Design a protein around this ligand. Structure first.
Ligand SMILES: Nc1ncnc2c1ncn2[C@@H]1O[C@H](COP(=O)(O)OP(=O)(O)OP(=O)(O)O)[C@@H](O)[C@H]1O
Ligand SMILES: Nc1ncnc2c1ncn2[C@@H]1O[C@H](COP(=O)(O)OP(=O)(O)O)[C@@H](O)[C@H]1O
Ligand SMILES: Nc1ncnc2c1ncn2[C@@H]1O[C@H](COP(=O)(O)OP(=O)(O)O)[C@@H](O)[C@H]1O
Ligand SMILES: Nc1ncnc2c1ncn2[C@@H]1O[C@H](COP(=O)(O)OP(=O)(O)O)[C@@H](O)[C@H]1O
Lengths: 1537, 386
C-alpha cells in the first residue's frame, strides 16, 4: 500500500483479487473499488484543489463525498454502497453540467472534459484560456491582456487584433459569458475593420499606406470586393488596360515594400501578393478574350465577392458569387496563413464545391495522394472566412472524438473536413457514416434538430461536411454516403503555374525560365532515376525547396545560382550514387552549372583522430548546410557505413566554430521500452512515471543550470525506425513542437533541441515522416582503408622513447601496395555470418597493437632484424585471425600460405603452429600437456583433453579478449563451443564466467539479474564487477535463439551492441547514464542456415570479432579418444595394451558414418563427437557394471553399445546390414562372433551385472514382471513380441545410463508411452503425469522443483512423462535444450530458492562442491522422454543440445511379423475355429490394409487394435447369444419329445 | 452467364445423344467463335449450314440467340419464377445503373398485392422497416427493401436474426452485383433472381418524362427536354464497357437533379435571347457530368457529346432521324409540353441505334460484339475441358 500526495492510501494489488473472485458480493466490491479510485483520481485532480468549482447542489455533494472519502481514508458495506451511488449520481450531474456548459458556448465542445474543467476552475486566474485558445479556435495563439481587460488576440502566425472596444473583467464572472462577448466582438471587430478598409479603398486611398494598418482579412475582403466591383464596371464596357496597369503598379509597389519589411509585414505582403497575382491573372485572361460571351464565361467561373448594401444586419452583409451560386461570408478571423496559389484547377475545385454546397450536399475528393485536396479544402474555407477543422485521419482516431468534433462542427457551423477517410476501422467508419448521413438528412430537409449521440442538438443552416479519399490503395465512398455526396477527381496539380507564382513572389527577376526549368528537372528526376521507396519528386519537395531558397537568396543573390544551390542542398542528400551521377548530368544539361568552415571541419577531424577524405568532407559539408535549417535530420547508410564519426565531427567542428557548448546524449530507442522512455498510467495505484525522454525534455526546458541558454543540445537515436516509436514523436517532428504525453501534461520545445535519427535502412518507414524531416543518405563507405588503419593506430596508441619508434616501425610494416592486394584477395573467401572487408580492420589492428604492447618489454635487448621478424609474424597472425577467422581450416591453410606470400620470402614465415617466445621461434606442438584422468570422472561432462587446436584456440582467445574486443563464436554443432569456453575460462586467472542461455523469448532483465550477483554499483554512475582484480566477462551461448520483432529486428542483440560499442546505457527507473569499465562479452552461436535460426544484424556483429569453430581433425579426435580408452582401460589390466587400435577403429567408423550419410534424407542424420562421447560412457558403465570380461566379450559389448547408440535412426534394413558389415570389417581389420541386434542381448534384469542372458530367461522375466504388474497396479491386457522386447531392451539400456536421455519415433497407439511407463516401473522410477492448458511455466517449475527436492531429500526414484501435447511453445524446447546440454540451468535457481536449496544440501550432507554434487545427482536421476509422431520439432534434432545426449531410437510402426504375433496371441483366447483359418483371416486383413493404404510415412495401427477388439467382443457376444438360443431350442425339443 | 450456362447444357446434351461428327462441328464452331482455329467442319445438316452462314456473315450474337431459340423452346420471366416458389423470400439483384423497383411495382399492380417501398438508412429508416415487416407479418403484403447494400451490417444483424408463416406473405430485397459480398445464409435461403433491362433509349426517355412533372417559361421545359435527352444518350453510351468509355461509370438520377437545378438557375437569372450555351456546356462537361471522369479521352468524348447536344443552333439533330424545333416567342408551356411529347412519339428507333443514336462508327460496335463473342467462347472452351 502506498499513499498519494494527501489523505487516502492506495493498495498495490490488482487483478489478483479479480482472479481469486472469478462471489456476487465480491464482484460488487471490486466494481465499487475500481469506480471509487478511477473517479477519486479526477476528484483529487480537479475537485480537491480548486475552490471556485466547489463554492450549488453539486458543490455540496462534492463536499459530502470529500468528507466520506476522508473518513474512508481514516478507516461498511452500506457505506460503500452509498459512495458508489453518490459517485454515479455526481458523474451524471457533472456530465450534464459539462454538456449544458458546452451548450452555452458551443466552441467549448471541442475540448476534453478535463480541459474544460480546468478552464471553468480558472475563475479568477483569467489566463488559463490563453494556452488553450489555439485548440479552441484554430488560428489564435494567445489573448493579450491590458490591465485586467482584453484589447487584442494573438494569431498563431503572430498577428494582434486591434479590437473596437475593450472588455472589463469583473470578479463574479465565468469564462463562458465573457468569451461569448469576446468572439461576438471578434466578428464585429473584423467587420468594422473590413468596412473602414473598404471605405478607404473606395475613397482612393493607396494600397501601400493601408497595408501596414489593418489585419489580413479586412484588407483581403476589401481588395477582393473593390476588384470585383471595378472589374464588373469595366466589363460592362470593352476596356481592360487601365485596371490591368493599376493592378500591375499595385503589385510592383507591394513588392517594393516587401523588400523593406519586418516579419508579420512580410507575411501580410506575401499573402496580398498572392491575391493580387491572382487578380492580374484573371484580368489578363479576360483581356485575351475576343468576344463578349466567352468573357462572361471566364468571369463566371472566377470567384466573385459581393456586399449587401441594403440589409442592415452586418454579419451576413457580404456574399460570394461563383457560377451563379451564392455563398454568404461569416466573418470569422483566420489570421495570416499561407495562401494557395490560384490555378485553373483550383478554380474548378472551388466551382464544384460551390455546386455541392448550393443544394444542401457535400463535396468529395479522391485520386492520387500528394495532390492538393485537404489544402484546397482549407483554402476554400479561408476564402469563405471560416476556419475548417481538418481531421488527420489515422489509426489514432476513434469513435468518441470524431463524434464530439462532428457535433461541434454541426453546432458551431464550422465545416468539418476529412483527410484520408479510407484510413478508418470498419465499425468506426460505419458509425461516422451513419452520423454523416443523418447530418446530410437534416441539412436537406432543413430540420432544426438532428437526433444524434442520444440527444437533440441544434443545427445551424451553414454547416457542412467535406471528405477526401484515396481509393484502390482501398475503397470509394460507401453507398449510404454515395447517395448524398458529389464525387470529384483532382488528379493534376498545375505545378507550372505554382512555381511561376512562387518565383514571382520571392522577388526573382525571371520566374518563367526558373519555373519551367525546375518543373522539367523534377519530372526528369522522377522518371530517370531508380524507383527507391524513399524518393518523392512531386510538389511537396518543390515547395520545400522554394521555401528553403530564401537564406541562399540573402547570401548569394537572386538567380539560377540560388536555385541550383538549393537543389544541391536539399534533394541530393537523399539520393543514392547512380541517382547522384544522373542528378549531376541533368544539372549540367539543364542549368548553367567560405573555406573557414572547411578549415574548422579539417581541424576538428585532425584533433579527433579521424582523417579527412574528399567525399567525407563533401558529405560533412552537406550535413552542416542541411542542419543549418531543419530541426530533425535522419542519416542513413549501410551497416558500418561510418555516420557516427561524421555527426560527432560536425558537432565538435561547430563547437569550435560558434563557441556554444555542445551537449549530446546517445539513446537506443528500440531496446528502451515506450513506458521507460515516456511513461504510463499504473493499473495498481494509477501513478505516472517520468520517462527518460520526458526527463531529458524537462531538464533541457527548465534551464535551471543555465547551460541550455548558451548551448546546443542533441539527442541521437542509433537504431531503426519503429513506426509506433515515431507516432509518439510526430508532434515534436511537426511544426507544433509541443510534447504529447498520455497523462495530460504538455512540454515545450526550444529551437536548439535538434533530434537525430541514426539508422541503416528505411524498410518500415512511412513516407509521410521522411517529408516532414530531412533525409541524408550515405551510399558509399566514408573512408579509405589506409585512413581507417591510421585512425585506428592513433586511437590504439592513445588507449595505452619506445612509442614513436614503435609507431614508425609499425607504419613501415603496413605498406599499402601489399595491403590492397591481400584485402582484395581476402574479399572473395568463404565467410560465415558474413562481414564486409571494411570492418575487420579494427580487430586486426587492435590484436596486432596489443601483441606489440605485450611484447614491448623485451625489444630493448633485441636487434632490429629479430624485432622486425617478431612484429611481422604477429601482424601476419593478426591478419589471419581477423580475416580468415570466418572460414574453414583448409581455407585457413590457404590463407596462411597467401599471407606468407604477399609479404615476400625475406620476412619471417608464418607457420600453422607458429609461436613467438623468448627472442626466437617456437612451436605449439610441444606445448600440449599430458593429462591422465582416471575412470571415476570420464562421465563428468566438463573434462577437456587438450590438443594442438585446443591450445591454439585458447591462446588466440586470451590474445583477442585481452585486445579489448568482442567474441562471437560460430561453427557447426559439436565443436565444443561451451567446452572450449569452460576450458579457456575456468582455468583462467584474470577472468570469471557468468552463464546465460538464450531461449526463443529472452528479456533484457534476465541478463541484468544474472550479472547482478557478480557486479557492484559505484557512484549507479559506474558499474564494476563484485571482484576487484579479475575482469568479469559475460558468456552467452545459442545467442541466435531470441525471436525477431515485427519490423525485422531483435532487441536483445541490440542491447548487447549497446553494451559493447557505447560502453554504457541508461538504467530504467532512474534514467541515469551508466558506465562500464572492465566487462567484456563473449558469444557462441550456430550458423544461420540451421532451421530455427535467424541472421543477426551486421550492425551488432560488426563491433565484435568473429571466430569460426569447425569440426576437429580425425587425428585430433583419435588422440583424444585414445586418451579416453587408456583412462577407461585403467580399470581392466589384461587389455591395457589394446588402447590405440580401438580408438582408431572408433574414429574410422565415425568417419565413414559421417561421410556415407547426407542430412537431406533424414533430419536426424547429423554427426558430431557427442555420440562418440556417449559411446565411451556406455562402454564405461557396461564395464563397471559387468563381470570379468574377455577380449571377445569386450568386442561384442562394444558392438552392442555401437548398435544401441549409433544404429537407431535408420529407415530400413539395408543400412543396418551395412553397419553390421562395417563393424565386421573394423573388428577384423583393427584389433568372429555374430554382431546382429538379436545376437547382442546384453542386459542386467536377470543377474547382478550387465551381461548376455538367455532369450527364454529374459522373456520369462518380462512375463513374470508383466503378470505381477497386472496383479498389483493396473489390469492392462497387453501382449509381448520381439520388436517391443528389443525396444524395451534399448530403452532400459538408455535408462540405466546416467544422464543419457532418449527419444522414440512411432505412430499413435504404438505403445511408446506404455513401454516407457512399464520400464519406469521395472527400474523403479516413479512416474508423474502433467495435467497440461490451465498451467504455465510457473506451475511447471514449481512441480519440477518439488520433485527434484523430494528426489534429492528422500532418495526417491523420480522421472517425468512428457507428451508432445504437453509441450506447446519453443520456450519449453529451449528449456529442455539447456537441461540436456548443462545440468544446472542458471535462471531457475537464484535468490530465496537458491538459499533454501543450499541450506537443505548443507543439512543433508563448499558452495562449489555442493553445486557440483547437485549437477551429479540431477544427471544421475533425471530422464525425460520425447515423443514425435510427425517426422515445430523438426529442427530440434538439428539443435546440438537436444542431440547432445538423447538416444534417437526408431521405434516405428508395427511390421508384418509383429502384427502376426499380436493377432495370433490375441485371437488365441476366444474360440473361433469352427469351419487353420486364423492365419488366413489375419493375412487377408493385413493384405487389405496394405492395398488400402497404397491406394490412399508410417501406418497408424489404431485401426488394427480397434478392429481386433471390436471383432473379438462382437464374436463373443454373438456366439453367447447363439449358444443361448441353441440351448433353448434343444430344451424345447427335449420337452416336446 | 445465362448464355454460358445455356451453351454448356446444350453441349452436354448434344455430345451424348449424337455422334462424334457433331462434336467435332461444335468444337470447330466454338474455335472459330474464339478466333482460335480455322477450319471448315465436315458438313453433311440445315441448322449447321445456317450456323456457317451466320459466322461467315460475322453476326455473332445472331448465331448465339439462334442457338438459344433452336435448342431451347421456352423462357422464364420474373412472373413465372415468382409464381412457382416453395419459399416466400426473394432477393432481387441488379446493377447500380439499372433500377428494379418499377418492375416490382408493375408486378404488384398485376398481382393486386400491396407493395411497400422501404429504402433503408438511418435509425428512423430501420424503425420504419421494422414496423412495415411487423405489419406484413401480422396481416400480409409485399415488402420491398430498396438498395440494402448501404446498410449491409444492419441487414446482417436484423434480417438474419428475423429469419433465424402468414398466408400470401412475400418480401423482396435489392442489392447491386458490383457491391459487397453478401453472407452465405442470405444467398441460399432465398430464390435468387436478377433483372437485365434492355437498353430502351426511347423507353427510358418516356419513363423520365413521366417521372418528372414539367419553372421559367418555354425555355425551361425545352432545356429540360434537351438535358433529359443528353442524359439518356450518355447512359446508353456508358453500357459499352470497352468502347463507349474506357471505364464503366454509373450516372444516376442525382446527377440529373443537379444538372436540372443548374439549368433552372441559369435560365432564371438569364431569360434573354442569348442564352449562355457555352457556360452551361462547360459547367455540365466539367463539374456536373465531368465530376467522376479523370482520363483525358473520356473528357474529350463527353465534351464532344455536349457540343453536339447543347449547341443550340438553328436546327438540331440529336439522332439522324428526328429534329427539334425550338419553342418560338408566343408559345405557352402546356402546348409546348404536348408538342415535345408528340415529337417524342413521332420518333421511331432504327435497329442500328447503338451505332447511330450514340455517334459511333459501325466498326466499333462490330469490334465490341467480336470481343464479347471471344470472351464467351473462351469461357465455354475453359468450361468444357472438365
Ligand atoms: N576520417 C576517418 N578516418 C578513419 N576512420 C574513420 C573516419 N571517419 C569515420 N571512420 C570510422 O568509421 C566508423 C564510424 O562508425 P559508424 O558511424 O559506422 O557507427 P554506427 O553508428 O555504430 O554504425 P551502424 O549504424 O552501421 O551500426 C568508425 O569505426 C571510425 O573509425
Ligand atoms: N495552390 C496549390 N495548389 C495545389 N496544391 C498545393 C497548393 N499549395 C500547396 N499545395 C500542396 O498540396 C499538398 C496537399 O496535399 P494533400 O492533398 O493534403 O495530400 P494528402 O491528401 O495525401 O494528405 C500540400 O502538401 C502542398 O504542398
Ligand atoms: N577437442 C575436444 N576435446 C575433448 N572433448 C571434445 C572435443 N571436441 C568435442 N568434444 C566432446 O564433444 C562434446 C561437445 O559438446 P558441445 O559442442 O559443447 O555442445 P553444445 O555446442 O551443444 O554446447 C563434449 O561432450 C565433448 O566431450
Ligand atoms: N500391442 C497392443 N495391443 C493392444 N493395445 C495396445 C497395444 N499397444 C498399445 N495399446 C493401447 O494403446 C493405449 C495407449 O497407447 P499410447 O501409449 O498412446 O501409444 P503411444 O505411446 O505409441 O502413442 C493403451 O491403453 C493400450 O490399450
Amino acid at each position: 500500500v502506498i499513499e498519494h500526495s494527501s489523505g487516502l492510501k492506495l493498495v498495490r494489488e490488482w487483478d489478483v483479487l479479480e482472479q481469486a473472485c472469478k462471489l456476487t458480493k465480491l464482484s460488487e466490491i471490486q466494481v465499487n473499488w475500481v469506480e471509487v479510485q478511477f473517479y477519486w483520481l479526477d476528484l483529487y485532480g480537479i475537485l480537491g484543489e480548486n475552490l471556485d468549482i466547489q463554492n450549488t447542489s453539486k458543490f455540496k455533494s462534492l463536499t459530502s463525498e470529500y468528507k466520506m472519502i476522508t473518513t474512508r481514508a481514516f478507516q461498511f458495506d452500506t457505506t460503500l454502497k452509498l459512495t458508489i451511488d453518490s459517485l454515479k449520481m455526481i458523474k451524471s450531474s457533472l456530465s450534464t453540467f459539462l454538456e449544458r456548459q458546452r451548450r452555452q458556448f458551443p466552441r467549448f465542445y471541442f475540448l476534453g472534459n478535463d480541459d474544460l474543467l480546468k478552464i471553468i476552475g480558472s475563475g479568477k486566474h483569467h489566463d488559463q484560456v490563453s494556452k488553450f485558445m489555439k485548440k479552441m479556435f484554430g488560428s489564435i495563439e494567445s489573448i493579450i491582456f491590458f490591465e485586467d481587460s482584453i484589447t487584442g488576440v494573438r494569431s498563431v502566425e503572430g498577428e494582434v487584433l486591434n479590437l473596437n472596444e475593450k472588455i472589463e473583467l469583473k470578479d463574479s464572472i465565468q469564462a463562458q459569458e465573457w468569451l461569448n462577448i469576446l468572439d461576438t466582438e471578434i466578428k464585429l471587430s473584423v467587420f468594422t475593420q473590413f468596412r473602414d478598409c473598404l471605405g478607404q479603398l473606395k475613397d482612393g486611398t493607396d494600397i501601400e499606406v493601408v497595408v501596414s494598418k489593418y489585419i489580413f482579412q479586412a484588407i483581403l475582403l476589401s481588395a477582393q470586393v473593390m476588384w470585383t466591383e471595378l472589374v464588373e464596371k469595366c466589363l460592362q464596357t470593352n476596356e481592360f488596360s487601365k485596371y490591368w496597369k493599376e493592378v500591375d503598379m499595385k503589385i510592383k509597389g507591394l513588392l517594393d515594400k516587401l523588400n523593406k519589411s519586418s516579419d508579420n509585414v512580410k507575411k501580410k505582403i506575401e499573402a496580398l501578393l498572392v491575391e493580387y497575382l491572382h487578380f492580374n491573372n484573371v484580368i489578363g485572361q479576360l483581356k485575351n478574350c475576343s468576344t463578349k460571351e466567352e468573357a462572361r464565361l471566364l468571369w463566371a467561373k472566377v470567384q466573385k465577392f459581393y456586399q449587401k448594401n441594403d440589409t442592415l444586419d452586418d454579419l451576413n452583409s457580404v456574399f460570394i458569387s461563383q457560377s451563379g451560386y451564392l455563398l454568404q461570408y461569416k466573418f470569422e478571423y483566420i489570421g495570416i496563413p499561407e495562401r494557395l496559389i490560384y490555378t485553373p484547377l483550383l478554380l474548378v475545385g472551388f466551382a464544384t464545391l460551390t455546386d455541392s454546397l448550393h443544394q444542401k450536399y457535400g463535396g468529395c475528393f479522391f485520386g492520387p495522394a500528394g495532390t492538393g485536396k485537404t489544402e484546397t479544402v482549407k483554402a476554400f474555407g479561408q476564402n469563405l472566412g471560416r476556419v475548417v477543422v481538418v481531421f488527420n485521419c489515422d489509426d489514432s482516431f476513434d469513435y468518441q472524438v470524431l463524434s464530439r468534433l462532428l457535433v461541434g462542427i454541426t453546432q458551431i457551423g464550422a465545416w468539418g473536413c476529412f483527410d484520408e477517410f479510407n484510413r478508418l476501422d470498419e465499425k468506426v467508419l460505419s458509425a461516422v457514416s451513419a452520423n454523416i448521413q443523418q447530418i446530410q438528412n437534416g441539412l436537406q430537409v432543413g430540420k432544426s434538430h438532428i437526433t444524434l449521440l442520444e440527444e437533440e442538438t441544434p443545427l445551424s443552416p451553414h454547416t457542412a461536411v467535406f471528405i477526401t479519399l484515396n481509393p484502390g490503395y482501398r475503397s470509394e465512398l460507401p453507398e449510404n454516403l454515395k447517395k448524398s455526396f458529389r464525387e470529384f477527381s483532382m488528379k493534376s496539380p498545375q505545378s507550372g503555374t505554382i512555381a511561376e507564382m512562387i518565383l514571382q513572389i520571392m522577388g526573382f527577376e525571371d520566374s518563367k525560365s526558373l519555373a519551367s526549368k525546375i518543373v522539367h528537372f523534377l519530372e526528369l528526376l522522377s522518371s530517370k532515376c531508380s524507383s527507391m521507396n524513399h524518393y518523392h519528386f512531386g510538389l511537396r519537395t518543390l515547395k520545400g525547396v522554394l521555401r528553403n531558397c530564401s537564406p541562399l537568396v540573402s547570401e548569394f543573390g537572386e538567380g539560377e545560382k540560388t536555385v541550383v544551390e538549393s537543389l544541391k542542398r536539399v534533394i541530393l542528400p537523399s539520393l543514392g550514387d547512380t541517382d547522384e551521377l544522373v542528378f549531376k548530368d541533368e544539372l549540367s544539361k539543364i542549368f548553367d552549372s567560405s573555406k573557414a568552415i572547411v578549415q574548422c571541419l579539417k581541424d576538428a577531424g585532425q584533433r579527433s583522430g579521424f582523417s579527412m577524405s574528399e567525399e567525407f568532407l563533401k558529405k560533412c559539408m552537406q550535413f552542416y548546410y542541411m542542419q543549418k535549417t531543419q530541426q530533425a535530420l535522419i542519416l542513413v547508410g549501410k551497416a558500418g557505413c561510418g555516420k557516427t564519426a561524421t555527426w560527432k565531427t560536425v558537432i565538435d567542428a561547430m563547437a569550435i566554430f560558434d563557441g556554444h557548448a555542445n551537449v549530446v546524449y546517445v539513446i537506443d530507442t528500440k531496446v528502451l521500452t515506450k513506458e521507460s522512455l515516456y511513461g504510463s498510467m499504473l493499473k495498481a495505484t494509477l501513478e505516472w512515471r517520468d520517462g527518460l525522454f520526458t526527463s531529458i525534455l524537462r531538464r533541457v526546458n527548465d534551464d535551471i543550470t543555465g547551460t541550455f541558454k548558451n548551448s546546443r543540445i542533441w539527442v541521437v537515436f542509433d537504431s531503426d525506425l519503429d513506426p509506433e516509436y515515431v507516432e509518439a514523436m510526430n508532434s515534436v517532428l511537426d511544426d507544433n513542437k509541443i510534447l504529447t504525453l498520455p497523462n495530460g501534461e504538455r512540454l515545450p520545445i526550444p529551437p536548439n533541441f535538434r533530434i537525430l535519427f541514426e539508422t541503416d535502412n528505411l524498410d518500415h518507414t512511412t513516407p509521410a515522416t521522411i517529408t516532414r524531416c530531412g533525409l541524408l543518405w550515405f551510399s558509399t563507405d566514408v573512408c579509405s582503408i589506409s585512413s581507417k588503419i591510421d585512425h585506428l593506430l592513433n586511437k590504439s596508441y592513445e588507449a595505452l622513447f619506445e612509442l614513436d619508434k614503435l609507431k614508425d616501425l609499425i607504419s613501415d610494416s603496413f605498406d599499402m601496395a601489399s595491403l590492397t592486394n591481400i584485402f582484395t584477395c581476402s574479399n572473395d573467401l568463404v565467410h560465415i555470418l558474413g562481414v564486409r572487408t571494411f570492418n575487420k580492420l579494427e580487430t586486426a589492428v587492435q590484436l596486432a597493437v596489443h601483441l606489440i604492447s605485450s611484447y614491448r618489454q623485451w625489444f630493448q635487448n633485441l636487434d632490429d632484424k629479430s624485432l622486425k621478424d617478431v612484429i611481422t609474424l604477429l601482424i601476419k597472425r593478426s591478419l589471419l585471425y581477423a580475416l580468415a577467422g570466418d572460414s574453414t581450416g583448409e581455407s585457413q591453410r590457404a590463407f596462411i600460405q597467401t599471407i606468407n606470400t604477399y609479404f615476400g620470402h625475406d620476412s619471417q614465415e608464418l607457420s600453422d603452429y607458429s609461436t613467438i617466445v623468448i627472442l626466437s621461434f617456437s612451436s605449439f606442438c610441444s606445448e600440449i600437456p599430458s593429462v591422465s584422468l582416471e575412470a571415476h570422472e570420464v562421465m563428468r561432462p566438463d573434462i577437456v583433453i587438450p590438443t594442438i587446436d585446443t591450445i591454439k584456440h585458447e591462446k588466440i582467445f586470451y590474445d583477442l579478449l585481452n585486445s579489448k574486443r568482442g567474441i562471437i563464436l560460430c561453427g557447426p554443432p559439436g565443436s565444443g563451443k561451451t567446452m572450449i569456453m569452460n576450458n579457456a575460462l575456468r582455468n583462467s586467472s584474470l577472468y570469471d564466467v557468468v552463464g546465460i542461455n538464450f531461449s526463443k523469448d529472452t528479456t533484457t532483465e534476465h541478463i541484468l539479474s544474472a550479472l547482478h550477483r557478480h557486479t557492484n554499483y559505484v557512484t549507479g554512475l559506474t558499474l564494476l564487477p563484485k571482484s576487484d582484480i579479475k575482469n568479469l566477462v559475460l558468456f552467452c551461448d545459442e545467442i541466435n535463439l531470441p525471436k525477431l520483432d515485427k519490423y525485422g529486428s531483435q532487441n536483445v542483440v541490440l542491447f548487447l551492441r549497446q553494451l559493447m560499442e557505447k560502453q554504457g546505457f541508461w538504467k530504467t527507473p532512474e534514467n541515469k547514464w551508466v558506465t562500464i569499465e572492465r566487462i567484456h562479452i563473449v558469444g557462441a552461436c550456430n550458423p544461420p542456415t540451421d532451421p530455427g535460426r535467424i541472421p543477426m544484424s551486421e550492425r551488432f556483429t560488426r563491433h565484435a570479432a568473429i571466430l569460426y569453430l569447425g569440426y576437429p581433425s580425425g587425428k585430433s579426435l583419435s588422440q583424444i579418444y585414445e586418451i579416453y580408452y587408456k583412462a577407461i582401460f585403467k580399470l581392466v589390466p589384461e587389455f591395457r595394451s589394446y588402447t590405440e587400435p580401438f580408438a582408431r577403429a572408433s574414429v574410422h567408423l565415425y568417419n565413414e558414418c559421417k561421410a556415407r550419410y547426407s542430412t537431406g534424407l533424414q533430419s536426424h542424420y547429423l554427426f558430431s563427437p557427442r555420440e562418440l562421447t556417449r559411446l565411451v560412457r556406455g562402454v564405461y558403465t557396461a564395464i563397471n557394471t559387468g563381470p570379468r570380461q574377455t577380449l571377445r566379450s569386450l568386442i561384442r559389448l562394444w558392438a552392442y553399445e555401437a548398435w544401441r547408440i549409433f544404429a537407431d535412426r535408420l529407415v530400413g534394413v539395408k543400412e543396418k546390414n551395412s553397419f553390421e558389415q562395417l563393424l565386421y570389417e573394423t573388428v577384423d581389420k583393427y584389433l568372429l562372433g555374430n554382431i546382429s541386434s538379436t545376437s547382442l542381448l546384453f542386459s542386467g534384469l536377470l543377474s547382478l551385472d550387465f551381461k548376455e542372458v538367455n532369450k527364454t530367461d529374459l522373456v520369462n522375466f518380462i512375463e513374470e514382471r508383466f503378470k505381477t504388474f497386472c496383479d498389483e497396479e493396473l489390469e492392462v491386457p497387453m501382449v509381448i513380441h520381439e520388436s517391443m522386447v528389443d525396444h524395451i531392451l534399448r530403452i532400459d539400456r538408455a535408462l540405466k545410463q546416467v544422464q543419457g536421455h532418449m527419444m522414440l519415433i512411432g505412430a499413435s497407439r504404438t505403445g511408446k508411452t506404455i513401454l516407457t511407463r512399464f520400464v519406469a516401473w521395472l527400474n523403479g522410477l516413479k512416474i508423474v503425469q502433467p495435467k497440461i492448458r490451465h498451467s504455465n511455466l510457473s506451475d511447471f517449475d514449481m512441480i519440477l522443483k518439488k520433485a527434484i527436492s523430494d528426489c534429492s531429500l528422500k532418495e526417491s526414484r523420480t522421472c517425468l512423462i512428457i507428451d508432445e501435447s504437453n509441450i506447446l511453445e519453443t520456450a519449453f524446447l529451449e528449456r529442455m535444450n539447456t537441461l540436456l546440454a548443462n545440468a544446472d540451468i542458471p535462471d531457475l535457481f537464484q535468490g530465496e530458492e537458491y538459499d533454501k536449496l543450499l541450506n537443505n544440501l548443507r543439512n543433508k550432507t563448499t558452495e562449489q562442491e555442493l553445486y557440483d554434487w547437485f549437477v551429479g545427482e540431477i544427471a544421475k536421476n533425471l530422464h525425460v522422454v520425447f515423443t514425435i509422431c510427425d517426422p515445430k520439432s523438426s529442427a530440434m534434432i538439428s539443435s546440438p543440445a537436444l542431440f547432445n545426449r538423447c538416444i534417437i531410437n526408431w521405434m516405428g510402426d508395427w511390421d508384418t511379423k509383429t502384427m502376426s504375433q499380436v493377432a495370433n496371441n490375441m485371437v488365441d483366447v476366444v474360440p473361433m475355429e469352427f469351419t487353420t483359418i486364423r492365419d488366413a483371416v489375419v493375412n487377408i486383413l493385413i493384405h487389405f490394409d496394405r492395398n488400402f493404404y497404397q491406394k490412399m510415412n508410417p501406418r497408424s495401427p489404431g485401426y488394427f487394435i480397434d478392429g481386433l477388439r471390436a471383432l473379438v467382443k462382437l464374436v463373443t457376444a454373438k456366439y453367447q447369444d447363439l449358444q443361448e438360443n441353441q440351448r433353448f431350442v434343444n430344451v424345447g425339443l427335449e420337452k416336446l419329445n | 452467364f445465362k448464355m454460358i450456362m445455356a451453351m454448356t447444357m446444350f453441349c452436354l446434351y448434344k455430345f451424348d445423344i449424337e455422334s462424334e461428327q457433331y462434336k467435332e462441328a461444335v468444337l470447330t464452331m466454338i474455335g472459330v467463335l474464339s478466333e482460335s482455329s480455322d477450319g471448315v467442319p465436315k458438313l453433311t445438316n440445315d441448322d449447321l449450314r445456317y450456323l456457317w452462314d451466320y459466322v461467315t456473315t460475322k453476326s455473332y450474337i445472331s448465331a448465339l440467340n439462334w442457338f438459344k431459340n433452336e435448342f431451347f423452346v421456352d423462357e422464364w420471366n420474373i412472373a413465372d419464377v415468382v409464381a412457382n416458389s416453395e419459399n416466400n423470400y426473394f432477393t432481387m439483384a441488379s446493377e447500380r445503373d439499372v433500377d428494379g423497383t418499377f418492375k416490382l411495382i408493375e408486378l404488384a399492380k398485376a398481382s393486386k398485392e400491396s407493395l411497400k417501398i422501404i429504402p433503408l438508412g438511418s435509425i428512423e429508416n430501420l424503425n420504419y422497416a421494422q414496423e412495415e415487416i411487423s405489419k406484413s407479418k401480422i396481416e400480409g403484403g409485399w415488402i420491398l427493401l430498396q438498395n440494402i447494400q448501404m446498410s449491409l451490417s444492419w441487414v446482417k444483424t436484423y434480417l438474419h436474426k428475423h429469419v433465424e408463416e402468414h398466408e400470401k406473405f412475400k418480401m423482396f430485397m435489392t442489392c447491386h452485383l458490383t457491391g459487397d459480398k453478401l453472407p452465405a445464409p442470405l444467398l441460399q435461403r432465398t430464390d435468387r433472381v436478377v433483372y437485365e433491362d434492355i437498353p430502351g433509349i426511347l423507353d427510358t426517355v418516356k419513363d423520365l418524362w413521366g417521372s418528372q412533372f414539367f419553372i421559367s417559361g418555354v425555355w425551361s421545359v425545352y432545356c429540360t427536354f434537351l438535358l433529359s435527352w443528353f442524359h439518356a444518350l450518355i447512359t446508353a453510351r456508358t453500357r459499352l464497357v470497352p468502347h463507349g468509355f474506357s471505364k464503366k461509370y454509373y450516372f444516376n438520377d442525382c446527377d440529373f437533379q443537379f444538372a436540372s437545378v443548374y439549368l433552372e438557375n441559369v435560365l432564371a437569372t438569364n431569360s434573354t435571347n442569348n442564352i449562355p450555351w457555352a457556360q452551361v456546356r462547360d459547367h455540365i462537361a466539367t463539374i456536373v457530368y465531368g465530376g467522376k471522369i479523370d482520363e483525358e479521352k473520356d473528357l474529350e468524348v463527353v465534351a464532344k457529346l455536349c457540343a453536339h447536344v447543347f449547341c443550340g443552333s438553328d436546327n438540331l439533330q440529336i439522332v439522324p432521324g428526328v429534329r427539334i424545333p425550338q419553342p418560338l416567342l408566343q408559345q405557352s408551356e402546356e402546348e409546348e409540353r404536348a408538342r415535345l411529347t408528340a415529337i417524342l412519339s413521332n420518333t421511331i428507333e432504327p435497329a442500328d441505334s447503338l451505332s447511330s443514336w450514340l455517334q459511333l462508327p459501325r466498326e466499333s460496335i462490330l469490334d465490341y460484339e467480336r470481343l464479347q463473342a471471344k470472351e464467351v467462347a473462351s469461357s465455354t472452351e475453359q468450361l468444357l475441358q472438365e
